[PDB]
Each structure stands twice: as structure tokens, then as C-alpha cells.
Amino acid sequence: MKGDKKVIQHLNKILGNELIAINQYFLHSRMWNDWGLKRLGAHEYHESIDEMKHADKLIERILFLEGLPNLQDLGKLLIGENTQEMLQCDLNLELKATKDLREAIVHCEQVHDYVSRDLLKDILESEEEHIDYLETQLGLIQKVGLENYLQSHMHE
Amino acid sequence: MKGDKKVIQHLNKILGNELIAINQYFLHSRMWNDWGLKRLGAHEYHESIDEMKHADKLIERILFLEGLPNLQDLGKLLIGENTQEMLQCDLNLELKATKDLREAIVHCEQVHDYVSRDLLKDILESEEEHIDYLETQLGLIQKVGLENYLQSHMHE
Amino acid sequence: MKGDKKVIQHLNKILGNELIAINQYFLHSRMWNDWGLKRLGAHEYHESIDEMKHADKLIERILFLEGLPNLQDLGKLLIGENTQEMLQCDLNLELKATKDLREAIVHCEQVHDYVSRDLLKDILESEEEHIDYLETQLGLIQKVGLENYLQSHMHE
Amino acid sequence: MKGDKKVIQHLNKILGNELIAINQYFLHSRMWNDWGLKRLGAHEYHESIDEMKHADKLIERILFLEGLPNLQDLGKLLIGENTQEMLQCDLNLELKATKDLREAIVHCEQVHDYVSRDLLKDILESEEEHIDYLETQLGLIQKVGLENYLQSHMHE
Amino acid sequence: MKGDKKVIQHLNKILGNELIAINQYFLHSRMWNDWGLKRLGAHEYHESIDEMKHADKLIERILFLEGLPNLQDLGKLLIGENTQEMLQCDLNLELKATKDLREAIVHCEQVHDYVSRDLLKDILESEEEHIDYLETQLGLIQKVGLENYLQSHMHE
Amino acid sequence: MKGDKKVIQHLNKILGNELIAINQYFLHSRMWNDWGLKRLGAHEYHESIDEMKHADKLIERILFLEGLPNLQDLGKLLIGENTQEMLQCDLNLELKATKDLREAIVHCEQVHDYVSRDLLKDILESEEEHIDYLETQLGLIQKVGLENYLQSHMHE
Amino acid sequence: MKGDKKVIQHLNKILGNELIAINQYFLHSRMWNDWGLKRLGAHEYHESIDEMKHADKLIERILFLEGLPNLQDLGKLLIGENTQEMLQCDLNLELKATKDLREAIVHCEQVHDYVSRDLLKDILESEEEHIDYLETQLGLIQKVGLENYLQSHMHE
Numbered sequence A, B, C, D, E, F, G: 001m002k003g004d005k006k007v008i009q010h011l012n013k014i015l016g017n018e019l020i021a022i023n024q025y026f027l028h029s030r031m032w033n034d035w036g037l038k039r040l041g042a043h044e045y046h047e048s049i050d051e052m053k054h055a056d057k058l059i060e061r062i063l064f065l066e067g068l069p070n071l072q073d074l075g076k077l078l079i080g081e082n083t084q085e086m087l088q089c090d091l092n093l094e095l096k097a098t099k100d101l102r103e104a105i106v107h108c109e110q111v112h113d114y115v116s117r118d119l120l121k122d123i124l125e126s127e128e129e130h131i132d133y134l135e136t137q138l139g140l141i142q143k144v145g146l147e148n149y150l151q152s153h154m155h156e
């Protein structure tokens, strides 16, 4: 199905954010595992899988709209150096990514690509779940203190 | 365990090839799916999961040796335009990556990092399977013809 | 609950498209079964059932909005004479019908009938799947050849 | 049980044919597997196992009849270089070998070794099955064409 | 994948040892069974099957490296006349064969064929287990006496 | 099978390290259980069992190679008097042991005792997992504090 | 609970005997397995595990009584070089150990450490079962002869 060319540019920009998240979150997962924080590591692993599934859906939509998925260009990864930096780096990636999802949805609606909009709203639903998780961990660290927070995420 | 710095560079070089292969085979898988060659698509999908698992093991080894895994740098993806070309792009990438594996196994052996050698050998075993899959598909295309070959890979 | 008269006219227009498709896909399904192309016949039968379910949901929404569903006017059936034409005829109806879905969705949004919009988007999601199935078969005919394509769809 | 010295010699001649077939069919099996014709490789593998069981039964009868099984002397393996040649090589081996089985059955009759006759009759029953399979494949290559024939034996 | 010609010769040389061992051990096994030493016969059958599996893996690897497997040239079978002689002949063969396995491993390492080296290492692990079994039987014959040793292996 | 005399001396040296580890870790497990740190006690008991399995495999190998396992000469146990030091005592033992594993792997490689190298490489694989566990616990003590770390390991 | 200093010294003396027994019996079990006397090997492995359980219970008791388990000072292992002598080596070790158990039971009784007496009496119960097993095997060697006795313990 010939799809709108700016829609496809948008889809490819969102795809570009997923591929950053995939790699960013996977490395965070394995850093946590390596430091003995296996509960943070497991959860972060599943975040990474969600982003992999976002990427898949975008790639499949782009191809169906007869565009060319771009897996070549990869933005800056925000790799933190400690647990609090790492959650904040994820948050900042998410908030940026939702900005771009909103503008892409706006464009889909102008052009009447309601299916692409439905796809992008479903991803948006999921990134707002991620943001809620990230904000809440940053909040808990304040409430229970960093030492207690890490202790509670040592063991699954 | 403080690892040998050049061993870690080598591991990061291998990882860089895994990252190329992940994206390349994942896109090839989805192209085949989008064209209705679902059986090619499923097989290429599992090859990408395999490279995801290679990348995972490399990342965990680098962190154990106290290096920094590099997911930022992504080499060139060779995306073909038809089935013979996609298989040959995968083959070229695999053959190039076994060269890097062999040079890195040599160096692990020189510095007595036998466990890293074991991981690289197991990865190498899996890449020689991939090479065998790809060379065999290219051969079957010559023997049965491209149209029959694709016919046999439409339905899963 | 009293609906916007123009939303109801749109809904009746979409219904008119569904009723064409129902009869066209069902007749195509049975032509393919009669020619011994049973795997095409089975899939076309299921597409026909999908259109019946679209029609059903539209009829129910129209009665809820206190309009009169129009099952009396039946537009033009596009019956093909061979596999390639039948696929193309269906694809032509689907693209015609998706244009009417997008204009009816615009109107639903202008008058704030968001439940009718939800329904029409769900139907549109499924037509874009139908279009993908149909584009893809026509692409497979090109790639594997017509005789092979038909061979692969003789048997369930 | 002291067995007839020439019966024992006939049993070692059949044994020698079996040992040729074991190696010949097992190499053909693995060549077909290595080319991606797994349905031909698997069938040929089962033929090789049949030949192993023949050999086993002959070895056991020879030793019962107080002879010395000869596993030392190996005739010429006929190794084709493509599917048609491989099949014909196997058919040639089966035909030469039935001739030798008939001669041993004749001699077993004349000296009243009816139990060795029964064993050889059973092996011959199996060689005629192998012959029927080989001739039928070579005939199918004619009837459906070689590309199709190989297409139909890529997959299990 | 085109492999080192001299590695392939080494594999073919290991393969030639396997083919000796297969025949030598199958015959010894059937000899013990005919003499009513069924437990010796059963164990020796399983060693012969091991050698078959070794030969299989070597054939498949030669063919992937694009060499030609040599199943034609069968070396000297060393066949005993009594239990003590037969065990000692197997042992002589295993020790010769592991000398060739070590020389072939050395060569794989020199040319970086690490996967062939893993295969050979796995075969050698199994040959050392065979040597252990054989030296230990010859040991037990000395400790329990020949008649007791044979008595203990009449029944399975 | 007569083994190389220096290989056996090396295997006895590795074995002396295992015997130190068994005792040190077993006592450490029972100190922690006695202090009510059952989660540390239990994991340390399993570390001790791993060393018992290493000792076992080395003894079996030495005997196969016709050497004498030396279980008589017990090196210095490092028993701390508090949790952090006991973790550090175990880490220094592991780091000295791997020194000796690598030296011994190098000698097996020179004299072509590849099966012994395999066994030693597997043990090494397992000592690096031990080193990783120990390094990480000392790391968590800093990240979460000594009292939380102990708290987290009171209860199974 | 502060324990009596001589009781703890006695428990450490018993413990030193257990540690000798663990090693002597474990090596004996692995010599017999290596000679193909698996029924002796296996039973001796379980004797060794019994001593490991005795060592365990004594360590736990010493720690409860706030002493230091001495696992460092390993007495003389009696390793024979043949089956009869190994049985006799184990019997002399057991007979010397019970000497020390009785002396220690007497001291627990004088200082009213009744729970320690219980533990020591249970171990004693178990050493007399060991003495009974060992005495009986040396008796059967005379009654049935060395070669039959060994024959009977080749196979599980």
C-alpha cells in the first residue's frame, strides 16, 4: 500500500528511538546483573524486549507502506554509571521519545493514516508505562534511601 | 576479574559484528515475511535471535573482565534487494566475522584467557552453522531454480 | 440514542461496500474450490466471513443510532475470470472501500461520534490486512511464477 | 554347527556386497544432506542401515556355521557426483548384488542348507525393495523433471 | 566453506582409523556373542556404534569443508582368536589411532581451524574412554583369573 | 594409559588447591550458619560441593594416567573471623588457584594432553564463576552497606 | 553457649580422624573404580560420605560451643596398594578412631556435656557398622578366595 512519505519518515524516526532504547536498556540490564542487582537487571531486560517488539511492529508497518526501514543510523546511547544515573538516562530517553511519538501521531491524523496512528498510540501507551516505572523508582530512592533501594533489588 | 585490555578490544570487535548481524538479519527476516516468503522469514528471524544471544554472551563477558561493552558503533548493513542477494549479503558478513573470531581466539590463547577462548569457539561453531545454512540455500537455488526455491519457502 | 444523520449515511455507505465484498469473495471462494484450488478457496471463504462480521457490526451500530440499515442496494460485483483477475478485483474493492472509511472517520471526528470512529478504525485495520494479503499474493505470483503459485494452493 | 565350506564362501561374498553398499549409501546420504536434499539423505541413510542389518545377519550365520567372516576386503564404491548419478550407482550395485544372492540361494538348495537359504531369500526380498525404490526415483525425475524432483526432496 | 587441504587429509586419516575400528569391533562383538559371552558382546557392539558415530561426524565435516571423504581404503583389521587377544588388539588400535588424533589436533590449531579441533578433541575424549575400558578388562583378567572374568560376562 | 609426569604433577597441584578450598569453604559455610546467616551459609556449602566435584574429577584423571593422587599434604587454610574477610579469603584462594590452572593448561597443550586440558579448562570456567560471585558480594557490601548486606542473607 | 575446653579439644580430635577417613576412603573408592571393582568403589564412596556427615556434625557442634574447628592438621593417610590391604587400612583407622570416641564420651560424661555424648555415641554406632562391614569383607576373602571375592565386586 503506497503510504504517505512524511508518515514513513516519522515511523523511521520513531524506529530510530527504539533502536537506541533496545541497546541502552540491554546494556543497563547486564550491568545490573553483573553488579548483583538481579531484580533491576531482570526488569530492565524485559523493558529491552518491549522495545524490541516496538521496533518489530514499526519495521513491519514501514515495509507494508512500501518504505525502507532504517536500522543503519543509531543515535547517542545514554549509558549511566550508577543505578540513579541509569534510571534517569532511561527517563530522558523515554520523554524525548514520547515527544516524537506525539508529532508523528499529529501527522498521521492530518493525512488520515489512522492505522499508523493506532500503532503509534499503542506504543505511546507502552512508553508511558515505562515512564511511570522510571519516575517511581527515582521516587522510591528518595523515600527509602539509596542503600535500602538497592538491597531490595539484589534478589529476585 | 581485570581482563587483558587487548582481549577486551577483540571481544568488542566481535560484538560489533554481532550488532551488524542482528539488525541485518532482522530486516531480511521481515522483508521475506512482507513478501510472503514466511519460511525464509522465520528461519532468518531465528538467525537474528542467535546473533542476539551471541551479543548477550559477549556483553556479559566484557563486563566480567571489567571492560565497557560498545553498543554505540554500528558498521555497514548490507541490505539486498532480492533473495539471492540477501543470502549472499549474510554470507559475506558471516565470512568476515569468522576472520575476526579466529584472530581473537589466537590472542586469547597467547595471553591464557582460556574461558574467553571457549566462548569465542562456541560462537565460532555457531557461525560455521550459519555459513553452512547460507551456502546451502545458494546451492539449492542453482539446483532447483529460484522459482521452485521460493515456492518451497512460501508456507511455514 | 439519536445519531448524526450524516454519520448514519456514511455508515450505510460502508455497509454497502461490505455487502459487495461478501458476495464477491464468497463467489470467488467457490470458483476456486470448483477449480480444485482449495487453499485459495478456503482463505477467500474466510475473507468473506470477515466481511459478514463487518456488515453485522455496522448494522448494529446503525440501529443503535436509530437509523435504517440499507441492505437493499447492492453495488457492482467485480467477478474475475482467473486467479490473477480475482485477486486484483478484490484489491480494487478494498482500496475503493478504504477511501470511504477514511472520509467517514473524518466526519465522525468532526461531530464527536468517537464510538463510531472506533468501530470504523477497527474495520479499517482489517481492510489493510486484506490489502496486505492481496498485494502479497500478486507479488508471489511474480516471484514464484503463476503455475507454481497455483500448484501451492491446490491442496490444504 | 559345521557348515558347508562353499556356503560360507557365498555368505562372505554377499557380506562383501553389503559392506560396499553400507559405505556407498552412507556417503551418498551425507552428500545429499550436505546439499540440502534432506529427504533424499534421510531415506538413503535408512537404506544404509538396512545394509548394516544384512551384514549383521550374514556375520552371525557365518560364525554359527563355524566360518570366518571376511570384513577386510572392500570392493569398489560407486560414488556419483550428482543426484541422477548417485541413484544409478546404487541401482548398479543392487543389480550386481541380486545376481550374487541368486547364485548363493541355488548353492544353498543343492546342499540342503535351507536355513541359510531362508536368510538369503529375506535379504533378496529387501534388495528388490531397494531396486524398486531406485528405479522409481529415476523414473520420477523423467516424469516431473529434475528441478521439481529435487524440490520435492529438499524438506522432511 | 573451503578448508585447509592438509586438515582434510588429517580428517580422512582419522576417518580411516574409524572404519577399521567399526569392522574390527563389530566382528569381535559377534564373535563374543557366538561364543555365548553375551555381555562382552553387548559392550563391544556399543563401542562399534561409537566408532560409527565418529565416522559420521568426520564424514559430515569433511564434506562441509568441501573435501572428499575416503571410505574406500580400509586398513588392516587386527582380529583376535581368544578374549585376551581380542581386547589387546582393540587396545593396540586405539593407541595408534590416538597418536593420529593428537597429530591432527596440532595441525588444526596451527591453521586456526578451531571447530575441526573441537570435533577431534571430542573424538579423542571418547577414545580415551575406550582405552580405559580395555586396559581395565585386561587388568581384571589378571586379578580375577580368566575363567572368572569370562564367567562374569556370559550373561547380560 | 601412561601419562606425562609433569602433567600429573600439575594435576596434583591443582588437586591440592581443591582440597584447601573444600575445607575453607565448608568451615565458612558452617560459621555463617552458626551466626544465623543461612543464605550465605547455604551458598557457601554449594561452593564447597563444587570443589569436592573438582577434586573428584582430578583424582579420577590422575589414576587413569597411572599417577598417585596426593590427598595428604594440606596447604594453608585462610579462615577469616568476619563476613567481609571470609569473602576476601575465598577470593584470594580462587585467584591463586587460577594462576595454577593456567600454568597447567599450558603444559597439557605442549605435551598434547588435550583431554587433561579440557578437564582443566572446565574447572577454570567454574573458578571464574566463583570469582565473579565473590567479587560481586564484596561490591554489594559497599553499595548497600554491611548491615543491609548481612540482613539480606539472614533468611532463606 | 560456652563449652568445656577439654570437650572441644576432644571433638577436634575426633574431627581430625574424620578428615583422615574422608580422604582415605574417597581415594580408595576411586582406586577401586579405576580398577573396575565398581561394587567396592561404590560402597566405599558411601563410607566416605558418612565420614563427611560425621565431620559436618562435629564442626557444627564445636562452633555452637564457641570453639574453633581445626580443619588444617591432616594426620597420616593409610593408602594400601591392593584390595585386601586397603580393607585392612580402613579397619585399622576405624579401630583407632573408636579408641578416641570412647575416651571423649567418658569426658563428656564427667563434665555433664550430655548432648555432646549423644552426638559422639551416634558416630560410634556408625563406626561399629563400618568395622563390621570391613571385618566381614576380610572374612569373605578367606572363605570364598580373593579371585571370587574380587569377581563378585566387579559389577553393580
Ligand code: HEM
Pocket (backbone or CB within 6 Å): A019, A022, A023, A026, A027, A049, A052, A053, A055, A056, A071, B022, B023, B026, B049, B052, B053, B055, B056
Ligand atoms: C534491531 C534490533 C533488534 C530487534 C528488532 C530485536 C527483536 C527481538 C524480538 C522480536 C525478540 C523476541 C521477543 C519475544 O517474542 O518475546 C527478541 C529477543 C531477544 N533479543 Fe532482540 N532485537 C534487537 C536487538 C537486540 C540486541 C541489540 C540484543 C542484545 C544486545 C538483543 C537480545 C535479545 C535477547 C537476549 C532476546 C531473547 C531471546 C530468547 O527469547 O531466547 N536483541 N529480539
Ligand code: HEM
Pocket (backbone or CB within 6 Å): C019, C022, C023, C026, C049, C052, C053, C055, C056, C071
Ligand atoms: C447481509 C449479508 C450477510 C451477513 C450480514 C452475514 C453474516 C454472517 C455471520 C455473522 C456469520 C457467522 C460467522 C462466524 O462467526 O462463523 C455468517 C456465517 C456464514 N455465512 Fe454469512 N452473512 C451474509 C451473507 C452471506 C452470503 C451471501 C453467503 C453465501 C452465499 C453467506 C454464507 C455464510 C456461511 C456459509 C457461513 C458459515 C455457516 C456456518 O457457520 O455454518 N453469508 N454470516
Ligand code: HEM
Pocket (backbone or CB within 6 Å): D019, D022, D023, D026, D049, D052, D053, D055, D056, D071, E019, E022, E023, E026, E049, E052, E053, E055, E056, E059
Ligand atoms: C561392518 C560394517 C557395519 C556394520 C555391521 C554396522 C552395523 C550397524 C548396526 C547393526 C546398527 C544398528 C541398526 C539398528 O538396529 O538401528 C548400526 C547403526 C548405525 N551405523 Fe552402522 N554398521 C557398519 C558400518 C557403518 C559405517 C561405515 C558407518 C558410517 C560411516 C555407520 C554408521 C551408523 C550409524 C550413524 C548408526 C546409527 C547409530 C545410532 O543409533 O545413533 N555404520 N550400524
Ligand code: HEM
Pocket (backbone or CB within 6 Å): F019, F022, F023, F026, F049, F052, F053, F055, F056, F071, G019, G022, G023, G026, G049, G052, G053, G055, G056
Ligand atoms: C578429598 C576431599 C573430598 C572429596 C573428593 C569429596 C567428594 C564429594 C562428592 C563427589 C560429593 C557428592 C557431590 C554430589 O554429587 O552431590 C560429596 C558430598 C558431600 N561432602 Fe565431600 N568430598 C571431600 C571432602 C569433604 C569434606 C572435607 C567435607 C566436610 C568437612 C565434606 C562434606 C560433604 C557433604 C556434607 C556432602 C553431601 C553428601 C550428599 O548429600 O551427597 N566433603 N563429597
Ligand SMILES: [Fe+2]
Pocket (backbone or CB within 6 Å): A018, A021, A050, A051, A054, A123, A127
Ligand atoms: Fe519503545
Ligand SMILES: [Fe+2]
Pocket (backbone or CB within 6 Å): A001, A063, A064, B034, C132, C135, C136
Ligand atoms: Fe506489501
Ligand SMILES: [Fe+2]
Pocket (backbone or CB within 6 Å): A006, A103, A107
Ligand atoms: Fe509532520
Ligand SMILES: [Fe+2]
Pocket (backbone or CB within 6 Å): A118, A119, A122
Ligand atoms: Fe491497536
Ligand SMILES: [Fe+2]
Pocket (backbone or CB within 6 Å): A021, A051, A094, A126, A127, A130
Ligand atoms: Fe519505551
Ligand SMILES: [Fe+2]
Pocket (backbone or CB within 6 Å): B018, B021, B050, B051, B054, B123, B127
Ligand atoms: Fe554471531
Ligand SMILES: [Fe+2]
Pocket (backbone or CB within 6 Å): A034, A035, B001, B063, B064, F132, F135, F136
Ligand atoms: Fe563483577
Ligand SMILES: [Fe+2]
Pocket (backbone or CB within 6 Å): B006, B010, B103, B104, B107
Ligand atoms: Fe590480537
Ligand SMILES: [Fe+2]
Pocket (backbone or CB within 6 Å): B118, B119, B122
Ligand atoms: Fe563453552
Ligand SMILES: [Fe+2]
Pocket (backbone or CB within 6 Å): B021, B051, B094, B126, B127, B130
Ligand atoms: Fe552468525
Ligand SMILES: [Fe+2]
Pocket (backbone or CB within 6 Å): B153, D155
Ligand atoms: Fe528450507
Ligand SMILES: [Fe+2]
Pocket (backbone or CB within 6 Å): C034, C035
Ligand atoms: Fe468443474
